């Protein structure tokens with residue numbers, strides 16, 4: 001009944017899990033428990049199509065990243081997440097995109113660049129920098145807050161709409 005396999009990747013602590021939990025369970029996770037690998041499933045209607053989202057939430061911490069490449073292999077589309085108050089996480093996006101291209105053996109994989117924690121005032125990554133990166137990659141850039149839920153549905157549904165153009 002139409003399934004989309006989405007994978008969420010990016011540096012430790014940027015909010016991958018909080019984003020996923022906000023989408024699937026409609027609440028904010030305030031605490032930080034590092035992820036190894038977790039999956040979620042939810043039936044939703046997107047643009048008039050009932051479908052099943054399978055979301056793989058991956059490790060950002062190098063210590064918990066064992067076998068992440070094996071899980072990413074099945075993904076149909078990827079959210080590449082950084083946090084707008086974490087310059088390193090933005091600088092490291094290229095690594096995740098490279099890893100995606102490797103595991104998929106393609107330079108044409110559906111992706112969305114996500115700048116999370118947009119509720120925070122200590123911004124060090126400006127919108128324009130991220131837009132430029134996204135433009136060079138040929139993908140959309142969307143800002144989100146897992147805390148307020150702003151942009152969360154848009155980020156994931158946009159990724160579905162990208163998969164649908166493939």
Ligand SMILES: Nc1nc2c(ncn2[C@@H]2O[C@H](COP(=O)(O)OP(=O)(O)NP(=O)(O)O)[C@@H](O)[C@H]2O)c(=O)[nH]1
Nearest residue numbers: 012013014015016017018030034035060117145146
């Ligand atoms: N203000 C704010 N805090 C956020 C946001 N998203 C996540 N956080 C906070 O940042 C911390 C880490 O979030 P988490 O989702 O666990 O990050 P992660 O990217 O999944 N980490 P890991 O890679 O280790 O699994 C938590 O304390 C969480 O509440 C956001 O949009 N805004």
Ligand SMILES: [Ca+2]
Nearest residue numbers: 027028029030
């Ligand atoms: Ca909470």
Ligand SMILES: [Ca+2]
Nearest residue numbers: 102103104105
């Ligand atoms: Ca490969």
Ligand SMILES: [Mg+2]
Nearest residue numbers: 016017034035
């Ligand atoms: Mg996590």
Ligand SMILES: [Mg+2]
Nearest residue numbers: 124125126129
């Ligand atoms: Mg600057």
